Amino acid sequence: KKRPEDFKFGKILGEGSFSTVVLARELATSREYAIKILEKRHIIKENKVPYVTRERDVMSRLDHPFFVKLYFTFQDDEKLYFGLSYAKNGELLKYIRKIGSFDETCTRFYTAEIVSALEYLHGKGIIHRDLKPENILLNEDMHIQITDFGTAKVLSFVGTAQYVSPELLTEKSACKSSDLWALGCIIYQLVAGLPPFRAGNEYLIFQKIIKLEYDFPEKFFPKARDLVEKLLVLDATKRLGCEEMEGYGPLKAHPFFESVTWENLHQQTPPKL
Ligand SMILES: CCc1cc(-c2c[nH]c3ncc(-c4cn[nH]c4)cc23)nc(N)n1
């Protein structure tokens, strides 16, 4: 079992309500991990014990390159430590903001791995419920690494405003289709630069979401547009990739992906941004 004195803590890699992720180097081996530190009392006072328990249960069952791994967990008298994979290139959102918008190849590659990752995840019966470009990170080799499993559900919660789905703003029920909506939202953002639904405040965004109030830029890849129109359907049972639509097969079979080779994506050279 690992201890805090076994590490050299560095910069903070992201904060949160109940957590802070710190860059930590392991002394004996010199490997760098991103440690999520959570204070036991703030968790108890705020009834988050089922949310932390779940995260650890969820992460301990992922074994795929497109997800961040949990290497160890240890604790002291006041804090919990979940040692996680360190993704050197950080959030995908940054690369979008720095290049403005991805070319068709870059959108095809990254959309494919995101699409590939959700097929493994949903294949296991786990739902992210908070998928966004701030959770999709990039490793040394520039492959995606999906994190933030605190709000994950194994088949009560509502994620980040801009990537929420109509069903959540109505029924109060998230299914795999909630992830496929976020996916639809993230595609738009890769081609266009900005999320599809944008407004002055959360209420105006929610009202713009439920009315499907969004319009594609005049220079949007047509195949990518048609795919976005297919994921961004108000009716959750009519969403490409969902089980009522016969799953990932047809999503994976969509024209936008004609040249993609799904089998060894993690072994492929990512394109230059
Ligand atoms: C939402 C904060 C958060 C972050 C992470 C995380 C795990 N490994 C990481 N490696 C690098 C970075 C990073 C971000 N910017 N620059 C580097 C973040 C992470 N994990 C959880 N669960 N949450």
JSON list of N, CA and C in Angstrom, two decimals, residues 99-154:
[
{"chain": "A", "resi": 99, "resn": "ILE", "atom": "N", "xyz": [-6.72, 26.33, -31.66]},
{"chain": "A", "resi": 99, "resn": "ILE", "atom": "CA", "xyz": [-6.65, 26.20, -33.12]},
{"chain": "A", "resi": 99, "resn": "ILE", "atom": "C", "xyz": [-7.92, 26.77, -33.78]},
{"chain": "A", "resi": 100, "resn": "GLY", "atom": "N", "xyz": [-8.90, 27.14, -32.94]},
{"chain": "A", "resi": 100, "resn": "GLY", "atom": "CA", "xyz": [-10.17, 27.69, -33.39]},
{"chain": "A", "resi": 100, "resn": "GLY", "atom": "C", "xyz": [-11.15, 26.57, -33.65]},
{"chain": "A", "resi": 101, "resn": "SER", "atom": "N", "xyz": [-10.89, 25.76, -34.69]},
{"chain": "A", "resi": 101, "resn": "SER", "atom": "CA", "xyz": [-11.73, 24.64, -35.10]},
{"chain": "A", "resi": 101, "resn": "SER", "atom": "C", "xyz": [-10.92, 23.59, -35.86]},
{"chain": "A", "resi": 102, "resn": "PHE", "atom": "N", "xyz": [-11.22, 22.31, -35.61]},
{"chain": "A", "resi": 102, "resn": "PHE", "atom": "CA", "xyz": [-10.53, 21.18, -36.23]},
{"chain": "A", "resi": 102, "resn": "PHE", "atom": "C", "xyz": [-10.88, 20.99, -37.72]},
{"chain": "A", "resi": 103, "resn": "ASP", "atom": "N", "xyz": [-9.91, 20.54, -38.53]},
{"chain": "A", "resi": 103, "resn": "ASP", "atom": "CA", "xyz": [-10.10, 20.20, -39.95]},
{"chain": "A", "resi": 103, "resn": "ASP", "atom": "C", "xyz": [-10.89, 18.90, -39.98]},
{"chain": "A", "resi": 104, "resn": "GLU", "atom": "N", "xyz": [-11.34, 18.44, -41.15]},
{"chain": "A", "resi": 104, "resn": "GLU", "atom": "CA", "xyz": [-12.15, 17.22, -41.24]},
{"chain": "A", "resi": 104, "resn": "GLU", "atom": "C", "xyz": [-11.42, 15.98, -40.73]},
{"chain": "A", "resi": 105, "resn": "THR", "atom": "N", "xyz": [-10.13, 15.81, -41.07]},
{"chain": "A", "resi": 105, "resn": "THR", "atom": "CA", "xyz": [-9.37, 14.66, -40.59]},
{"chain": "A", "resi": 105, "resn": "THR", "atom": "C", "xyz": [-9.35, 14.61, -39.06]},
{"chain": "A", "resi": 106, "resn": "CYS", "atom": "N", "xyz": [-8.93, 15.71, -38.41]},
{"chain": "A", "resi": 106, "resn": "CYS", "atom": "CA", "xyz": [-8.85, 15.83, -36.95]},
{"chain": "A", "resi": 106, "resn": "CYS", "atom": "C", "xyz": [-10.17, 15.61, -36.28]},
{"chain": "A", "resi": 107, "resn": "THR", "atom": "N", "xyz": [-11.28, 16.11, -36.87]},
{"chain": "A", "resi": 107, "resn": "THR", "atom": "CA", "xyz": [-12.62, 15.83, -36.38]},
{"chain": "A", "resi": 107, "resn": "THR", "atom": "C", "xyz": [-12.94, 14.34, -36.59]},
{"chain": "A", "resi": 108, "resn": "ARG", "atom": "N", "xyz": [-12.55, 13.75, -37.72]},
{"chain": "A", "resi": 108, "resn": "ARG", "atom": "CA", "xyz": [-12.82, 12.33, -37.93]},
{"chain": "A", "resi": 108, "resn": "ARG", "atom": "C", "xyz": [-12.04, 11.47, -36.92]},
{"chain": "A", "resi": 109, "resn": "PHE", "atom": "N", "xyz": [-10.74, 11.72, -36.74]},
{"chain": "A", "resi": 109, "resn": "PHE", "atom": "CA", "xyz": [-9.96, 10.94, -35.79]},
{"chain": "A", "resi": 109, "resn": "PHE", "atom": "C", "xyz": [-10.49, 11.00, -34.36]},
{"chain": "A", "resi": 110, "resn": "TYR", "atom": "N", "xyz": [-10.63, 12.21, -33.79]},
{"chain": "A", "resi": 110, "resn": "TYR", "atom": "CA", "xyz": [-11.04, 12.41, -32.41]},
{"chain": "A", "resi": 110, "resn": "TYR", "atom": "C", "xyz": [-12.47, 12.03, -32.16]},
{"chain": "A", "resi": 111, "resn": "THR", "atom": "N", "xyz": [-13.39, 12.32, -33.11]},
{"chain": "A", "resi": 111, "resn": "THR", "atom": "CA", "xyz": [-14.77, 11.88, -32.96]},
{"chain": "A", "resi": 111, "resn": "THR", "atom": "C", "xyz": [-14.80, 10.35, -32.87]},
{"chain": "A", "resi": 112, "resn": "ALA", "atom": "N", "xyz": [-14.03, 9.64, -33.73]},
{"chain": "A", "resi": 112, "resn": "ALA", "atom": "CA", "xyz": [-13.91, 8.18, -33.77]},
{"chain": "A", "resi": 112, "resn": "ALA", "atom": "C", "xyz": [-13.49, 7.59, -32.45]},
{"chain": "A", "resi": 113, "resn": "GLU", "atom": "N", "xyz": [-12.44, 8.14, -31.82]},
{"chain": "A", "resi": 113, "resn": "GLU", "atom": "CA", "xyz": [-12.00, 7.59, -30.53]},
{"chain": "A", "resi": 113, "resn": "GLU", "atom": "C", "xyz": [-13.09, 7.91, -29.49]},
{"chain": "A", "resi": 114, "resn": "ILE", "atom": "N", "xyz": [-13.60, 9.14, -29.42]},
{"chain": "A", "resi": 114, "resn": "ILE", "atom": "CA", "xyz": [-14.71, 9.40, -28.47]},
{"chain": "A", "resi": 114, "resn": "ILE", "atom": "C", "xyz": [-15.82, 8.36, -28.69]},
{"chain": "A", "resi": 115, "resn": "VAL", "atom": "N", "xyz": [-16.29, 8.18, -29.95]},
{"chain": "A", "resi": 115, "resn": "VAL", "atom": "CA", "xyz": [-17.29, 7.19, -30.37]},
{"chain": "A", "resi": 115, "resn": "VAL", "atom": "C", "xyz": [-16.84, 5.77, -29.94]},
{"chain": "A", "resi": 116, "resn": "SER", "atom": "N", "xyz": [-15.56, 5.46, -30.10]},
{"chain": "A", "resi": 116, "resn": "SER", "atom": "CA", "xyz": [-15.01, 4.14, -29.73]},
{"chain": "A", "resi": 116, "resn": "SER", "atom": "C", "xyz": [-15.02, 3.88, -28.24]},
{"chain": "A", "resi": 117, "resn": "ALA", "atom": "N", "xyz": [-14.68, 4.90, -27.43]},
{"chain": "A", "resi": 117, "resn": "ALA", "atom": "CA", "xyz": [-14.64, 4.87, -25.97]},
{"chain": "A", "resi": 117, "resn": "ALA", "atom": "C", "xyz": [-16.03, 4.64, -25.39]},
{"chain": "A", "resi": 118, "resn": "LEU", "atom": "N", "xyz": [-17.07, 5.39, -25.88]},
{"chain": "A", "resi": 118, "resn": "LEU", "atom": "CA", "xyz": [-18.44, 5.23, -25.40]},
{"chain": "A", "resi": 118, "resn": "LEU", "atom": "C", "xyz": [-19.04, 3.87, -25.74]},
{"chain": "A", "resi": 119, "resn": "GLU", "atom": "N", "xyz": [-18.49, 3.17, -26.75]},
{"chain": "A", "resi": 119, "resn": "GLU", "atom": "CA", "xyz": [-19.02, 1.86, -27.08]},
{"chain": "A", "resi": 119, "resn": "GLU", "atom": "C", "xyz": [-18.53, 0.86, -26.03]},
{"chain": "A", "resi": 120, "resn": "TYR", "atom": "N", "xyz": [-17.27, 1.03, -25.50]},
{"chain": "A", "resi": 120, "resn": "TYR", "atom": "CA", "xyz": [-16.68, 0.19, -24.43]},
{"chain": "A", "resi": 120, "resn": "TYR", "atom": "C", "xyz": [-17.39, 0.40, -23.12]},
{"chain": "A", "resi": 121, "resn": "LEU", "atom": "N", "xyz": [-17.61, 1.68, -22.77]},
{"chain": "A", "resi": 121, "resn": "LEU", "atom": "CA", "xyz": [-18.23, 2.17, -21.55]},
{"chain": "A", "resi": 121, "resn": "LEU", "atom": "C", "xyz": [-19.66, 1.71, -21.49]},
{"chain": "A", "resi": 122, "resn": "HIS", "atom": "N", "xyz": [-20.46, 2.07, -22.51]},
{"chain": "A", "resi": 122, "resn": "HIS", "atom": "CA", "xyz": [-21.84, 1.62, -22.60]},
{"chain": "A", "resi": 122, "resn": "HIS", "atom": "C", "xyz": [-21.92, 0.12, -22.79]},
{"chain": "A", "resi": 123, "resn": "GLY", "atom": "N", "xyz": [-20.83, -0.48, -23.27]},
{"chain": "A", "resi": 123, "resn": "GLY", "atom": "CA", "xyz": [-20.76, -1.92, -23.45]},
{"chain": "A", "resi": 123, "resn": "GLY", "atom": "C", "xyz": [-20.71, -2.62, -22.11]},
{"chain": "A", "resi": 124, "resn": "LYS", "atom": "N", "xyz": [-20.22, -1.90, -21.06]},
{"chain": "A", "resi": 124, "resn": "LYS", "atom": "CA", "xyz": [-20.05, -2.35, -19.67]},
{"chain": "A", "resi": 124, "resn": "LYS", "atom": "C", "xyz": [-21.28, -2.02, -18.81]},
{"chain": "A", "resi": 125, "resn": "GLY", "atom": "N", "xyz": [-22.11, -1.11, -19.29]},
{"chain": "A", "resi": 125, "resn": "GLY", "atom": "CA", "xyz": [-23.31, -0.67, -18.58]},
{"chain": "A", "resi": 125, "resn": "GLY", "atom": "C", "xyz": [-23.08, 0.58, -17.75]},
{"chain": "A", "resi": 126, "resn": "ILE", "atom": "N", "xyz": [-21.99, 1.30, -18.02]},
{"chain": "A", "resi": 126, "resn": "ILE", "atom": "CA", "xyz": [-21.65, 2.53, -17.31]},
{"chain": "A", "resi": 126, "resn": "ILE", "atom": "C", "xyz": [-21.99, 3.73, -18.20]},
{"chain": "A", "resi": 127, "resn": "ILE", "atom": "N", "xyz": [-22.55, 4.80, -17.58]},
{"chain": "A", "resi": 127, "resn": "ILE", "atom": "CA", "xyz": [-22.91, 6.07, -18.24]},
{"chain": "A", "resi": 127, "resn": "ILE", "atom": "C", "xyz": [-22.20, 7.22, -17.54]},
{"chain": "A", "resi": 128, "resn": "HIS", "atom": "N", "xyz": [-21.52, 8.05, -18.34]},
{"chain": "A", "resi": 128, "resn": "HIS", "atom": "CA", "xyz": [-20.76, 9.17, -17.88]},
{"chain": "A", "resi": 128, "resn": "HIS", "atom": "C", "xyz": [-21.61, 10.30, -17.25]},
{"chain": "A", "resi": 129, "resn": "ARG", "atom": "N", "xyz": [-22.74, 10.68, -17.92]},
{"chain": "A", "resi": 129, "resn": "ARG", "atom": "CA", "xyz": [-23.70, 11.72, -17.48]},
{"chain": "A", "resi": 129, "resn": "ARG", "atom": "C", "xyz": [-23.11, 13.15, -17.40]},
{"chain": "A", "resi": 130, "resn": "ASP", "atom": "N", "xyz": [-21.80, 13.31, -17.69]},
{"chain": "A", "resi": 130, "resn": "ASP", "atom": "CA", "xyz": [-21.16, 14.62, -17.65]},
{"chain": "A", "resi": 130, "resn": "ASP", "atom": "C", "xyz": [-20.04, 14.73, -18.68]},
{"chain": "A", "resi": 131, "resn": "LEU", "atom": "N", "xyz": [-20.23, 14.11, -19.82]},
{"chain": "A", "resi": 131, "resn": "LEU", "atom": "CA", "xyz": [-19.23, 14.15, -20.86]},
{"chain": "A", "resi": 131, "resn": "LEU", "atom": "C", "xyz": [-19.12, 15.55, -21.44]},
{"chain": "A", "resi": 132, "resn": "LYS", "atom": "N", "xyz": [-17.89, 16.05, -21.56]},
{"chain": "A", "resi": 132, "resn": "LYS", "atom": "CA", "xyz": [-17.57, 17.38, -22.08]},
{"chain": "A", "resi": 132, "resn": "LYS", "atom": "C", "xyz": [-16.09, 17.46, -22.48]},
{"chain": "A", "resi": 133, "resn": "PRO", "atom": "N", "xyz": [-15.69, 18.42, -23.35]},
{"chain": "A", "resi": 133, "resn": "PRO", "atom": "CA", "xyz": [-14.28, 18.55, -23.75]},
{"chain": "A", "resi": 133, "resn": "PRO", "atom": "C", "xyz": [-13.24, 18.86, -22.63]},
{"chain": "A", "resi": 134, "resn": "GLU", "atom": "N", "xyz": [-13.71, 19.11, -21.41]},
{"chain": "A", "resi": 134, "resn": "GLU", "atom": "CA", "xyz": [-12.90, 19.40, -20.23]},
{"chain": "A", "resi": 134, "resn": "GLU", "atom": "C", "xyz": [-12.54, 18.04, -19.53]},
{"chain": "A", "resi": 135, "resn": "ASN", "atom": "N", "xyz": [-13.28, 16.95, -19.86]},
{"chain": "A", "resi": 135, "resn": "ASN", "atom": "CA", "xyz": [-13.14, 15.58, -19.33]},
{"chain": "A", "resi": 135, "resn": "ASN", "atom": "C", "xyz": [-12.37, 14.69, -20.30]},
{"chain": "A", "resi": 136, "resn": "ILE", "atom": "N", "xyz": [-12.31, 15.09, -21.55]},
{"chain": "A", "resi": 136, "resn": "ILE", "atom": "CA", "xyz": [-11.62, 14.30, -22.56]},
{"chain": "A", "resi": 136, "resn": "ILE", "atom": "C", "xyz": [-10.22, 14.91, -22.64]},
{"chain": "A", "resi": 137, "resn": "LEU", "atom": "N", "xyz": [-9.21, 14.20, -22.12]},
{"chain": "A", "resi": 137, "resn": "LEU", "atom": "CA", "xyz": [-7.82, 14.71, -22.06]},
{"chain": "A", "resi": 137, "resn": "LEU", "atom": "C", "xyz": [-6.98, 14.16, -23.17]},
{"chain": "A", "resi": 138, "resn": "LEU", "atom": "N", "xyz": [-5.72, 14.64, -23.33]},
{"chain": "A", "resi": 138, "resn": "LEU", "atom": "CA", "xyz": [-4.83, 14.09, -24.37]},
{"chain": "A", "resi": 138, "resn": "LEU", "atom": "C", "xyz": [-3.46, 13.61, -23.85]},
{"chain": "A", "resi": 139, "resn": "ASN", "atom": "N", "xyz": [-3.08, 12.30, -24.00]},
{"chain": "A", "resi": 139, "resn": "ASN", "atom": "CA", "xyz": [-1.78, 11.81, -23.48]},
{"chain": "A", "resi": 139, "resn": "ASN", "atom": "C", "xyz": [-0.58, 12.26, -24.30]},
{"chain": "A", "resi": 140, "resn": "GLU", "atom": "N", "xyz": [0.63, 11.80, -23.94]},
{"chain": "A", "resi": 140, "resn": "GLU", "atom": "CA", "xyz": [1.88, 12.15, -24.61]},
{"chain": "A", "resi": 140, "resn": "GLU", "atom": "C", "xyz": [1.79, 11.92, -26.11]},
{"chain": "A", "resi": 141, "resn": "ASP", "atom": "N", "xyz": [1.15, 10.81, -26.50]},
{"chain": "A", "resi": 141, "resn": "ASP", "atom": "CA", "xyz": [0.95, 10.41, -27.88]},
{"chain": "A", "resi": 141, "resn": "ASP", "atom": "C", "xyz": [-0.25, 11.09, -28.55]},
{"chain": "A", "resi": 142, "resn": "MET", "atom": "N", "xyz": [-0.93, 12.00, -27.84]},
{"chain": "A", "resi": 142, "resn": "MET", "atom": "CA", "xyz": [-2.07, 12.75, -28.36]},
{"chain": "A", "resi": 142, "resn": "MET", "atom": "C", "xyz": [-3.35, 11.88, -28.59]},
{"chain": "A", "resi": 143, "resn": "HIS", "atom": "N", "xyz": [-3.48, 10.76, -27.85]},
{"chain": "A", "resi": 143, "resn": "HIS", "atom": "CA", "xyz": [-4.71, 9.97, -27.93]},
{"chain": "A", "resi": 143, "resn": "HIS", "atom": "C", "xyz": [-5.60, 10.49, -26.80]},
{"chain": "A", "resi": 144, "resn": "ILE", "atom": "N", "xyz": [-6.95, 10.37, -26.94]},
{"chain": "A", "resi": 144, "resn": "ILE", "atom": "CA", "xyz": [-7.87, 10.85, -25.91]},
{"chain": "A", "resi": 144, "resn": "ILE", "atom": "C", "xyz": [-7.79, 9.96, -24.68]},
{"chain": "A", "resi": 145, "resn": "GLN", "atom": "N", "xyz": [-8.09, 10.54, -23.49]},
{"chain": "A", "resi": 145, "resn": "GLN", "atom": "CA", "xyz": [-8.14, 9.83, -22.22]},
{"chain": "A", "resi": 145, "resn": "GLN", "atom": "C", "xyz": [-9.29, 10.47, -21.46]},
{"chain": "A", "resi": 146, "resn": "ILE", "atom": "N", "xyz": [-10.41, 9.75, -21.30]},
{"chain": "A", "resi": 146, "resn": "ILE", "atom": "CA", "xyz": [-11.61, 10.25, -20.62]},
{"chain": "A", "resi": 146, "resn": "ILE", "atom": "C", "xyz": [-11.57, 9.99, -19.13]},
{"chain": "A", "resi": 147, "resn": "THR", "atom": "N", "xyz": [-11.82, 11.07, -18.35]},
{"chain": "A", "resi": 147, "resn": "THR", "atom": "CA", "xyz": [-11.78, 11.14, -16.90]},
{"chain": "A", "resi": 147, "resn": "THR", "atom": "C", "xyz": [-13.12, 11.61, -16.24]},
{"chain": "A", "resi": 148, "resn": "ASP", "atom": "N", "xyz": [-13.06, 12.15, -15.01]},
{"chain": "A", "resi": 148, "resn": "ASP", "atom": "CA", "xyz": [-14.18, 12.68, -14.19]},
{"chain": "A", "resi": 148, "resn": "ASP", "atom": "C", "xyz": [-15.33, 11.68, -14.06]},
{"chain": "A", "resi": 149, "resn": "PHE", "atom": "N", "xyz": [-15.14, 10.64, -13.27]},
{"chain": "A", "resi": 149, "resn": "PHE", "atom": "CA", "xyz": [-16.15, 9.59, -13.11]},
{"chain": "A", "resi": 149, "resn": "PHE", "atom": "C", "xyz": [-16.95, 9.71, -11.87]},
{"chain": "A", "resi": 150, "resn": "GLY", "atom": "N", "xyz": [-16.88, 10.86, -11.23]},
{"chain": "A", "resi": 150, "resn": "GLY", "atom": "CA", "xyz": [-17.58, 11.12, -9.99]},
{"chain": "A", "resi": 150, "resn": "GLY", "atom": "C", "xyz": [-19.09, 11.06, -10.10]},
{"chain": "A", "resi": 151, "resn": "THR", "atom": "N", "xyz": [-19.62, 11.47, -11.26]},
{"chain": "A", "resi": 151, "resn": "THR", "atom": "CA", "xyz": [-21.05, 11.51, -11.50]},
{"chain": "A", "resi": 151, "resn": "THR", "atom": "C", "xyz": [-21.56, 10.35, -12.37]},
{"chain": "A", "resi": 152, "resn": "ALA", "atom": "N", "xyz": [-20.67, 9.38, -12.69]},
{"chain": "A", "resi": 152, "resn": "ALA", "atom": "CA", "xyz": [-20.98, 8.20, -13.50]},
{"chain": "A", "resi": 152, "resn": "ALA", "atom": "C", "xyz": [-22.05, 7.31, -12.87]},
{"chain": "A", "resi": 153, "resn": "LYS", "atom": "N", "xyz": [-22.84, 6.62, -13.72]},
{"chain": "A", "resi": 153, "resn": "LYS", "atom": "CA", "xyz": [-23.90, 5.75, -13.26]},
{"chain": "A", "resi": 153, "resn": "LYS", "atom": "C", "xyz": [-23.73, 4.36, -13.85]},
{"chain": "A", "resi": 154, "resn": "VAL", "atom": "N", "xyz": [-23.93, 3.34, -13.03]},
{"chain": "A", "resi": 154, "resn": "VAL", "atom": "CA", "xyz": [-23.89, 1.94, -13.45]},
{"chain": "A", "resi": 154, "resn": "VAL", "atom": "C", "xyz": [-25.34, 1.52, -13.54]}
]
